[PDB]
Ligand binder design. Structure first.
Ligand SMILES: Nc1ncnc2c1ncn2[C@@H]1O[C@H](COP(=O)(O)OP(=O)(O)OP(=O)(O)O)[C@@H](O)[C@H]1O
Ligand SMILES: Nc1ncnc2c1ncn2[C@@H]1O[C@H](COP(=O)(O)OP(=O)(O)OP(=O)(O)O)[C@@H](O)[C@H]1O
Ligand SMILES: C/C1=C/C(=O)O[C@@H]2C[C@@H](CC[C@H](C)/C=C\C=C\CC1)O[C@@](O)([C@@H]1CSC(=O)N1)C2
Ligand SMILES: C/C1=C/C(=O)O[C@@H]2C[C@@H](CC[C@H](C)/C=C\C=C\CC1)O[C@@](O)([C@@H]1CSC(=O)N1)C2
Ligand SMILES: [Ca+2]
Ligand SMILES: [Ca+2]
Ligand SMILES: [Ca+2]
Ligand SMILES: [Ca+2]
Ligand SMILES: [Cl-]
Ligand SMILES: [Cl-]
Ligand SMILES: [Cl-]
Lengths: 361, 371
């Protein structure tokens, strides 16, 4: 009688029962095995010394099915302590998940997990119903990828979704490399995890990258100190923003592509002139990486400089945009009319994978 | 490239091209099969006739309707109809156009499947979609929430739709429609000393029905005026050349939509069922339902029937509530129009159930629509 909501992402797996204000279980989307029968989640973490951690979900898409099965096995039985052949499951996916991909996912749930019924929703679309809209422009910047999904009354326009392969994780590797030069150690997978913390605690986006990269020399009351688990301390400079900035200047990491602000545009324009007014009016921030302070107003500015002088622009960055996707998953699956949207195990048996394709949401 | 919108009804088939304000083709849903001939010899099988082709030689051929009360009971004859609809009426190649098919509220899934299976197998349509008549009659009136009244020739469904979705449990199906009303006006005419009984005579009473008949507000306030004055009718010149006049009978006929007692039935009246529906719904929305009532169907074409409802229900529902009766002038084809609109829209491209899909999934796929 109680459905499940499992938002598996390149970095974190967000699980929980529908109708709950937040994901109950939240663990790393990793899977370890003897460095040469297989550990997973927060457990695998504590055995890094003798393991070889692999993220199954790569850039939002599933690339290692054998390990995903284990993540889901662990997600049901260990993390949630529940019976899969007893609960309707809602799984999220990434914009443009290749048909084949999704077809597989559906099969595994039935064939190998016996889900009574299930459904697959688009991460992006969900964050939107979580913000409270059916039409808009979503920005999903997490660990794996960063997408911009434009949605007209519930339907995301595939012809205009932009995929920026830089995100949260990538930002850490950069935060690292800019701390080796300002004199400091850091370089192993284990250490990588501490950068991720500084990156999550200090770093912030700035309005004027230059009127802030100048204050660097002058004052100094713009930075702070970080007490690492080693007891040793560190002082951080311009890095506090020369890091998230990348999101806007994918040059510091080489990359190539346009900044998140630009693509957010380069997408809106790939849409039909009619909806545009609403798409600029409803810009939704979603995903962990969209947490750096100032990223809100920064975007705000940076794009109104692309947009027509005659057009309202509203950036929406909800406080819980960290678990945004999950929430909408929860909400949606608790909705009355969704009931008839699930895909029964029976319907599966007769029709097969494919059926999981036409949805509506 | 251009979608086909075919509305299959108990008595008439409305088929046309998307984007048109009216169905190009409208023929009767029947098939003629030269009397008896249920033995060997006289070989050749005599073949069958469909549509207008039929009638015009009916004398020596028995007619059967494939759609009974809105549901398809004879696939064989139906196929034929569809064939005729594409090649002989619309004059097109079913393999080149996507088709939108209408169904009756609560159409048996088995059917929908058979229906979808036949369209893809015996016709090779590039893609199709099945819509619920009522819903379309609603989309065409310009709403996504309200209660629709579909009184056609073989059925009078009463469907409550909210935001584009029909509410199953809250649907009333009244096995009483136009065809019935005809048989009746035909009975009370031999009560005023007359004839008419051959299937060919039925067709004229139907003409007499659609021409004079009307629905008076208060029944026993007009019936009186019947015995009093006489300025309540007129006369009609049939082929016979002769002439007939019908007092009382003009309204005493459609009054069955309200007083099913008149022919037995024993089912509450259309005005009643309409209530019993709004009731079975969720109290939170009954408000939005009473203001969005929609008349749709050939039988909803009587003059005055509009206001007879305005009255007949206000009397049954909470005084504290504005009621609205929306009876568009086209309700005669409304079902189609809605579908025509539908088929001709961007957001719909997704909705079509392409063959490629049917090819890998089968009938079972024509169930996930959400409109
Ligand atoms: N408060 C914060 N400030 C900045 N970055 C944060 C914060 N909290 C989490 N993050 C970052 O956002 C990234 C994570 O997001 P999310 O939880 O959005 O990823 P997923 O959903 O796990 O992955 P994907 O987005 O690739 O599908 C993390 O890798 C982390 O570096
Ligand atoms: N102007 C009119 N006045 C009265 N009755 C009419 C009028 N026009 C049509 N009808 C009656 O309504 C019936 C037709 O409706 P419709 O076109 O509603 O039927 P269908 O769609 O053919 O059948 P069904 O809806 O029962 O499945 C006709 O067969 C006729 O008896
Ligand atoms: C609180 C937390 C959050 C999180 O998002 O973890 C994800 C998952 C994690 C898996 C690998 C590590 C060793 C194992 C366990 C980590 C546990 C908890 C870490 O790899 C990330 O760290 C990467 C690396 S660098 C970055 O930017 N993302 C993001
Ligand atoms: C103008 C017209 C309208 C119509 O709706 O016809 C439909 C179809 C028709 C088919 C049978 C007849 C003999 C053959 C051809 C008729 C052609 C046109 C008839 O049988 C109905 O008449 C019956 C009889 S009485 C009634 O209520 N339905 C409804
Ligand atoms: Ca995510
Ligand atoms: Ca947890
Ligand atoms: Ca779409
Ligand atoms: Ca009809
Ligand atoms: Cl990596
Ligand atoms: Cl708001
Ligand atoms: Cl009959």
């Amino acid at each position: 009688t109680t459905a499940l909501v499992c938002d598996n992402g390149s970095g974190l797996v967000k699980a929980g029962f529908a109708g709950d204000d937040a994901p109950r279980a939240v663990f790393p989307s990793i899977v370890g095995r003897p460095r040469h029968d297989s550990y997973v989640g927060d457990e695998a973490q504590s055995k890094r010394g003798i393991l070889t951690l692999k993220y199954p979900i790569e850039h939002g898409i599933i690339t290692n099915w054998d390990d995903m099965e284990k993540i889901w096995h662990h997600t049901f039985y260990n993390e949630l302590r529940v019976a899969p052949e007893e609960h309707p499951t809602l799984l999220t996916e990434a914009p443009l998940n290749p048909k084949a991909n999704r077809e597989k996912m559906t099969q595994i749930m039935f064939e190998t997990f016996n889900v009574p019924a299930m459904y697959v929703a688009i991460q992006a679309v969900l964050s939107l119903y979580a913000s409270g809209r059916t039409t808009g422009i979503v920005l999903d910047s997490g660990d794996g990828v960063t997408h911009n999904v434009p949605i007209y009354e519930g339907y995301a326009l595939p012809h205009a979704i932009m995929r920026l392969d830089l995100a949260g994780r990538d930002l850490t590797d950069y935060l690292m490399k800019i701390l080796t030069e300002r004199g400091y150690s850091f370089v192993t997978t284990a250490e990588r995890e501490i950068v991720r913390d500084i990156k999550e605690k200090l770093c912030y986006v700035a309005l004027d990258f230059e009127n802030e990269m100048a204050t660097a020399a002058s004052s100094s009351s713009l930075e702070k100190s970080y007490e690492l688990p080693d007891g040793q301390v560190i002082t951080i400079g311009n890095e506090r923003f020369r890091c998230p900035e990348t999101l806007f200047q994918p040059s510091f990491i080489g990359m190539e592509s346009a900044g998140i602000h630009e693509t957010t545009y380069n997408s809106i324009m790939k849409c039909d002139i009619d909806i545009r007014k609403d798409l600029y009016a409803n810009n939704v921030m979603s995903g962990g990486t969209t947490m750096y302070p100032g990223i809100a107003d920064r975007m705000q500015k940076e794009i109104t400089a692309l947009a027509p002088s005659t057009m309202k622009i509203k950036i929406i960055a909800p406080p819980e945009r960290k678990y945004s996707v999950w929430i909408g998953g929860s909400i949606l699956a608790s909705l009355s009319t969704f009931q008839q949207m699930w895909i029964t195990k029976q319907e599966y048996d007769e029709a097969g994978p494919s059926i999981v394709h036409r949805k509506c949401f």
